[PDB]
């Protein structure tokens, strides 16, 4: 038995204020340094308990520790995708090209219509959660869904390639209750290059994965 | 637009009575022909609604339809993994070798410790759900977790390689309320070569996705 | 400190085979002696942990232990209402009268419309759960809802007066996957006298719990 | 048939700035006028769909509409309890007497032990939700629990007599990520007069409902 590899906080791919005016520095700071850090620490702490259990040192509530692992792992991986999904206005914003634009044209009937559907998915998350654009390994097509918290409504298989955090902490300081305006403005920092790089990996690796 | 690719019910890799005496024919029949078919039909039905919305013919409750998609897609993919995860005793059962056994030693301290943990995870799912052995693309390590329903507690990233269905319909006609005995018996039909193939694909393809 | 009062498994109000042919003896036996008993034990086990935590004897995961309490307490109270909600065919079945019929006409446009809606609610629970007819203390009207597991989608305030268990263990041995047939057959053992009494209590007692008199 | 009685947004028992310095005016105002109002509308909108369905005027997804009703009704009743559970500091805060103090002594081993447990329950809500002190009709005793969102982990029977909102919108503008500090400060505005009156009604009324 070798000890588990610890999860690590991935640094932001841009400065804390690089997403202004659309997302303010203070949100980015809090979001990355308080919130994301906590998921990393929480996922590791769950695995530490599992380890002490396996080594016969303690007897854990397997369901409880696994619920802790699930929520914190999911928070960790969802944000790890969230950050590079965005970029400073210029590098971020506008409309996609390449392979992403092609499937969006094919599945959703154009960016316009995709954007409307994704925005509606994000805006209408009940409570806190995510709007998610995912690659389906079973059909090699794009799917849009919601995730509640970090780990509710998410499924096996589906590979998130573009996600928006619609937890209240993601916008409240700036947009107050107005999640709709947040989602509208988030489009101006979407890093279509990062998304494109993900659809590439998925088209190559996801079906041959399942 | 191109109309979404439909999901389809996979055939079982063996006859309905082939996992006897561990899982009786009537369960396998009902489970595949009734339950799994419902998920295929529901996942498609959800995507038909999204299509009509995209064609501008109807307006949908995006949240509601994506919850339907989520549950049925999850049910479909989880069962698609579940069937080939099992095999008629001989091909099914026993103790794993290869890379599966290798990381089972590294992560869990051996087959018996792993078996005990996986079994406890499976047995203690609250309500209906799944015990899941998954490959973590962020650490390239095994993780065990539970899923409730098909689409609760599941996270992005984690690739399920071995799953056990602990919904009541999976065992009740034979084991009645005794999920524990069903879980103990299920080990005798696990298709470890299938699990091995899945882990190999996961080691090859999963990490370069996130 | 004296701490907590324990939950106990109630007896059924009738023999295990008393709801036949609509619900078979085997289901009633397993459901009561194994499933319901398990919730009683689970709720008590959670309260024992909280106790030890409060005495400083251990330090629990409060979230985890409260999740266990929630699920098992909910299972216990839901089955506690479920059993007397039914009665052997004769006392059970048929159509309600009294205050329940009055509110069903007002809220739902009659019994046939109510039945169609309640049945749809029960039949379409995603995964395992309950169909629930409840009294709303804020409006003193009936409401129908679903509950998933025992403790998901349930809200504060609403007082369940008629519930149907649509967990798979409630019907599978007899109806197999055909939850629809089970739901249809279940109407034949509804104890409307029990539902009526619950509504009487709700009309008298529920509103003041929330809107102070 | 009679059209349903609509839910209405109650006024607060005090002005938006009356809970300062513990909860700032801007939070109280947004929380009441935006958040609570939205639940009232959401619960009414779900009931209207049910009505139109019953009148044979529209098609509904019964599950979806009932999920909408559940969430919004729950948000409404929980905030309806939340507001009078608080009072301007002076009338609010301090230490309970009467029947509430008596049960706190007998069950939790006194106020400080109760406060520590309730605070722990509130602080550790996973995602958004509520810390709840409820009266249990089966035992005529107090119980503590968490609720996630407004309508997850709540059970039948239990009557909330004291609740704390730990949705991020309840604290984020003032306390940022520091929910712990919010929970600690909230004790200074607890209206124990209100809690005592709720308990007295529950002692009188709750058990016979079941
Ligand atoms: Fe976040
Ligand atoms: Fe299944
Ligand atoms: Fe049951
Ligand atoms: Fe709130």
Swiss-Prot record, chains A, B, D:
It comes from Aeropyrum pernix (strain ATCC 700893 / DSM 11879 / JCM 9820 / NBRC 100138 / K1). Binds 1 Mn(2+) or Fe(3+) ion per subunit. It comes from the Archaea. It catalyses: 2 superoxide + 2 H(+) = H2O2 + O2. PANTHER family: SUPEROXIDE DISMUTASE 2, SUPEROXIDE DISMUTASE [MN], MITOCHONDRIAL. Destroys superoxide anion radicals which are normally produced within the cells and which are toxic to biological systems. Catalyzes the dismutation of superoxide anion radicals into O2 and H2O2 by successive reduction and oxidation of the transition metal ion at the active site. Its EC number is 1.15.1.1. This is Superoxide dismutase [Mn/Fe]. Mn(2+) binds at residues 31, 79, 165, 169. Its cofactor is Mn(2+); Fe(3+). The keyword Oxidoreductase applies.
């Amino acid at each position: 038995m070798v000890s588990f590899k610890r999860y690590e906080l991935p640094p932001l791919p841009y400065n804390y204020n690089a997403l202004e005016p659309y997302i303010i520095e203070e949100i980015m700071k809090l979001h990355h340094q308080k919130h994301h850090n906590t998921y990393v620490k929480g996922a590791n702490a769950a695995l530490e308990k599992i380890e002490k259990h396996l080594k016969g040192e303690i007897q854990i509530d397997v369901r409880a520790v696994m619920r802790d692992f699930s929520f914190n792992y999911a928070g960790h991986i969802m944000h790890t995708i969230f950050w590079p999904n965005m970029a400073p206005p210029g590098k971020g914003g506008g409309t996609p090209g390449g392979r992403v634009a092609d499937l969006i044209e094919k599945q959703f009937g154009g960016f316009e219509k995709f954007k409307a559907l994704f925005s509606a998915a994000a805006k209408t998350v009940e409570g806190v959660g995510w709007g998610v654009l995912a690659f389906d390994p079973l059909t090699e097509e794009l799917r849009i869904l919601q995730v509640e918290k970090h780990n509710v409504l998410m499924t096996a298989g589906l590979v998130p390639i573009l996600v928006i955090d619609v937890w209240e902490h993601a916008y409240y300081l700036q947009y107050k209750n107005d999640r709709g305006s947040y989602v509208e403005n988030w489009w101006n920092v979407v890093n279509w290059d990062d998304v494109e790089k993900r659809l590439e990996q998925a088209l190559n690796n996801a079906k041959p994965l399942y």
